[PDB]
C-alpha cells in the first residue's frame, strides 16, 4: 500500500550553465507522497532540499546546490486508488536561472521496465503491448470437442493469418524480447509470407516478462496473427502475442496407449484438414 522513492541528481556539465535546479517528479498513477518525510528532509540543519511542495501525484523540490557526484534523497508515498494499467511515469529537472535547460527521465514501477515494449526493426516499429500467450498443453491433458478446440479457434472466433509447424533449434535474447530460431517443416496456412516453404528459418519473439518458453529440439505448431517487422535477412518476423495457438506436437512416444491415441487422431485430422482445405465455415 506504500512505496519508497529515491531521487538522485548530479551535473557533469559544469562548463555550461550552472547554479541550482528544480526537481519536479510525478508520482505513480494513484500514489501521493508523505508530507512528514519531506518536512523532515527540509527542516534539517545541513538541509539538502531547501523548498518542497507536494500535491497528489506531484512533488516539487528545490535543490540549491547540484553536486557533481551522485546524491540521492528519498521519501515515502502511500496509495489511494489502484493502478489501472502498467505505465512508466516521468521526472523532470529544470535549471533555475534558465528553465529551458531541462532534463526529463522516464522511470518505471518497482518491477516493470522504464519504456513501453515495442518490436522495432529498421523502418517498421510494430507495437508489442498487451498480454503474452500461454502454453496450452491440450493434448497432454484430457479434453474433447467436435472440431472445436482448433478448427473453431482457426476459423470462428479468431482469424489466424498464418500457421506453421516448426522445430525449435536455438534460443536467444534481444533487448526485452526473447528470440526463438525455428525452421518450417510444412506450411499450413499463409497470407502475406508467400516465400515461406519447407526448410526455411523463421524468428519468433515473445516478451521476456512472463513464463512462456520453447524447449530446444521439440517440434511445435504455431498459429496467430501476421506481424509487420522483418528479420535481418529480409524475411517476415512474427510476434507470439495473445490469441495465438502454440502447441507442441506429440512425438507418438506418449500417445501409443489407447486413451491418448484418439486425441492424436483428432490432431492429425485437424492438421490434415487445415493444410488441405482453406478454413471452411
Amino acid at each position, epitope marked *: 500500500s506504500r512505496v519508497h522513492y*529515491t531521487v538522485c541528481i548530479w551535473r557533469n556539465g559544469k562548463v555550461g550553465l550552472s547554479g541550482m535546479a528544480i526537481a519536479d517528479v510525478t508520482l505513480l498513477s494513484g500514489f501521493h507522497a508523505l508530507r*512528514a*518525510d519531506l518536512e*523532515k528532509l527540509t527542516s534539517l540543519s545541513d538541509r539538502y532540499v531547501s523548498h518542497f511542495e507536494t500535491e497528489g501525484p506531484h512533488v516539487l523540490l528545490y535543490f540549491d546546490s547540484v553536486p557533481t557526484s551522485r546524491e*540521492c534523497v*528519498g521519501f*515515502e508515498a502511500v496509495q489511494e486508488v489502484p493502478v489501472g494499467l502498467v505505465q512508466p511515469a516521468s521526472a523532470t529537472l529544470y535549471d533555475y536561472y534558465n528553465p529551458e535547460r531541462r532534463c526529463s527521465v522516464f522511470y518505471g514501477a518497482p518491477s516493470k521496465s522504464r519504456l513501453l515494449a515495442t518490436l522495432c526493426s529498421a523502418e517498421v516499429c510494430q507495437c508489442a503491448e498487451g498480454k503474452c500467450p500461454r502454453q496450452r498443453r491440450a493434448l497432454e491433458r484430457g479434453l474433447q470437442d467436435e472440431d472445436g478446440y482448433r478448427m473453431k479457434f482457426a476459423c470462428y472466433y479468431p482469424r489466424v493469418e498464418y500457421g506453421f509447424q516448426v522445430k525449435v533449434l536455438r534460443e536467444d535474447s534481444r533487448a526485452a524480447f526473447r528470440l526463438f530460431e525455428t525452421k518450417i517443416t510444412q506450411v499450413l496456412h499463409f497470407t502475406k509470407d508467400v516465400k515461406a516453404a519447407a526448410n526455411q528459418m523463421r524468428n519468433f519473439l515473445v516478451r521476456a516478462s512472463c513464463r512462456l518458453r520453447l524447449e530446444p529440439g521439440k517440434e511445435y505448431l504455431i498459429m496467430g496473427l501476421d506481424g509487420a517487422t522483418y528479420d535481418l535477412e529480409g524475411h517476415p518476423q512474427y510476434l507470439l502475442d495473445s490469441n495465438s495457438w502454440i502447441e507442441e506436437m506429440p512425438s507418438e512416444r506418449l500417445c501409443r496407449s489407447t486413451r491418448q491415441r484418439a486425441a492424436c487422431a483428432q490432431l492429425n485430422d485437424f492438421l490434415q484438414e487445415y493444410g488441405t482445405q482453406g478454413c471452411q465455415v
Partner: nanobody
Amino acid sequence: VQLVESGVQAGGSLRLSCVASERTYMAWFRQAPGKEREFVAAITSSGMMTEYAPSVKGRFTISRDNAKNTVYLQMNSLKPEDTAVYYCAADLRQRFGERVTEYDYWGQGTQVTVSS
C-alpha cells in the same frame, strides 16, 4: 546526533533496543571478526516499512516507538551461528534500503554471543 544501543543459548530469543535523539530511519548492521560487516534489516522513519536480509526472512522483526523514538528488533528463533557485533546506524537523507555502507555517524554497537 548520537546513537545509543543496549540489550544466549541457541534457539532462544532476544530483543535489542537502539535509542536516538533524532527520529529517523535508523537501520541495523552486523559485523563479524575477520570479515566485512553485513546488514541485517532496515526500517523507515514512520515504521510502516521494513526490509530484512535474505538469510533472516520472516524470522527477525523491527518496530519503533512513537513516544521515546527508539527502534526495537526482536530475534525469536535465534540461529546458532549468527554471532556478531550488532550496530544501529542511520543517515539524515532517508535512503531507505541503502544496502551498501553509506551510513554516517556510525554507532558503537554491542557484543552478543551465542552458544550452541
